[PDB]
């Protein structure tokens, strides 16, 4: 662009677009389970991925992944969404935080416990 | 809580003799003797060429594991060095050397920096007269580091300052085994130190 052109139009400042309309750009959003289906992966994977249709307090109704070995979520349990997609399931852009509200932690867990929210086991 | 755990193991991983015990790290047992290979189930196994990164990460870990400083403190002393005018490399070493714990060690009042550190936190050391219980305290030039009068009578300080008779002290320092005094003369020039560390790489570790 000639300088004159630059002086007439300038450069467009590129704006960013969120991957997590968890609204209020909060770090988390509380929600409620509407459904607790199972979903199959894409690209080159196979399994019965566990998901949840959460009714957001931010006025949204999104689906969220349920990390961990096994869960205990029913068609009415309160839950905290956290942001972070699941590469294998297009459309799933949030995870449920294990250990908060009606979502139990992950029993039998031993390592990445802070994640999965599981209290420190006693080494008596 | 500056580490607090197996130490002759760090000498091992660093593949170099680190004197993190003063005594014993001389008598056929620093472990770096007849077992100079890293610790753990794979310590002996064949080693693959490290990444320019690893080489830089170990060098820093070496230099820091010597003084006992935490990354938090280490990093900050480095940033202060960086900011100041004068070859960061050396200046950093100089600031590391000015730490009271280390100075108390250079003067022999204690045999290891760890012991040295404890001797400061327990009020057995003094500076220009008033006692200072801060390992991180920074000694300036002209400062006198004595021994807590009420502590000059401890079996630990006796042995040590006794073994000091005959021992020479670093050119930037000077001591009087008599009244158990010692004087910080100047910041040790890089040349005055014989550290098993190439601080140029340390600097690079923080460039990335």
């Amino acid at each position: 662009p000639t300088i004159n052109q630059l002086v007439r139009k300038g450069r467009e400042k590129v704006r960013k677009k969120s991957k997590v309309p968890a609204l209020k750009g909060a770090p988390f959003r509380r929600g409620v389970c509407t459904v607790v289906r199972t979903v199959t992966p894409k690209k080159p994977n196979s399994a019965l991925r566990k998901v949840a249709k959460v009714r957001l307090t931010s006025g949204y109704e999104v689906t969220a992944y349920i990390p961990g070995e096994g869960h205990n979520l029913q068609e009415h349990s309160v839950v905290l969404i956290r942001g972070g997609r699941v590469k294998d399931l297009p459309g799933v852009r949030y995870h449920i935080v294990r250990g908060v509200y009606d979502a139990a932690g992950v029993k039998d867990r031993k390592k990445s416990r802070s994640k999965y929210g599981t209290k420190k086991p006693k080494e008596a | 809580g500056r580490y607090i755990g197996p130490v002759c193991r760090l000498c091992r991983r660093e593949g170099v003799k680190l004197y993190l015990k003063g005594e014993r790290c001389y008598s056929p047992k620093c472990a770096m003797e007849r077992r100079p290979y890293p610790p753990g189930q794979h310590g002996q196994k064949r080693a693959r060429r490290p990444s320019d990164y690893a080489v830089r990460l170990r060098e820093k870990q070496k230099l820091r594991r010597i003084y006992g400083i935490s990354e938090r403190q280490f990093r900050n002393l480095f940033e202060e060095a960086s900011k100041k005018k004068g070859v960061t490399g050396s200046v950093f070493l100089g600031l590391l050397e000015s730490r009271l714990d280390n100075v108390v060690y250079r003067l022999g009042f204690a045999v290891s920096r760890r012991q040295a550190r404890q001797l400061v936190r327990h009020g057995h050391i003094t500076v220009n007269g008033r006692r200072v219980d801060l390992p991180s305290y920074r000694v300036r030039p002209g400062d006198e580091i004595a021994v807590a009068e009420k502590s000059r009578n401890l079996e630990l300080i006796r042995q040590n300052l006794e073994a000091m008779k005959g021992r020479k002290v670093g050119p930037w320092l000077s001591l009087d085994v008599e009244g158990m005094k010692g004087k910080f003369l100047r910041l040790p020039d890089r040349e005055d130190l014989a550290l098993p560390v190439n601080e140029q790489l340390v600097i690079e570790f923080y460039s990335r």
């Binding site: 300088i3 004159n4 630059l6 002086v7 | -």
Partner: protein, 104 residues
């Protein structure tokens, strides 16, 4: 110091008042090239003395009406519509850019 500006008269159509077009010139904050911007000021002419095309000095003054804070200091050079012209044409080009197409 009361600001003093020079410009051309582009309108005597008012009573005791004239419009002075003042040219400003300067380096663009980021792109550097000297750019020329302009602005019309409604100066006070107590004796409907100044006419179109007259280059006049304008002096910062005591408010005389909403939108009118200047008085004609003096006349620099009488006559020279060439400037007034540029202005009028630029004004006429306007009837065009819209829902159709005027003149060129």
């Amino acid at each position: 110091p009361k600001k003093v500006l020079t410009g051309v008269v582009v309108s005597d159509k008012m009573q005791k008042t004239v419009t002075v077009l003042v040219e400003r010139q300067f380096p663009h904050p980021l792109y550097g090239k000297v750019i020329k911007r302009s602005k019309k000021y409604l100066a006070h002419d107590p004796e409907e003395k100044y006419k179109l095309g007259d280059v006049v000095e304008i002096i910062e003054s005591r408010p005389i009406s909403k939108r009118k804070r200047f008085r004609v200091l003096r006349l620099v050079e009488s006559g020279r519509m060439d400037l007034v012209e540029k202005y009028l044409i630029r004004r006429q080009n306007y009837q065009s850019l819209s829902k159709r197409g005027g003149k060129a």
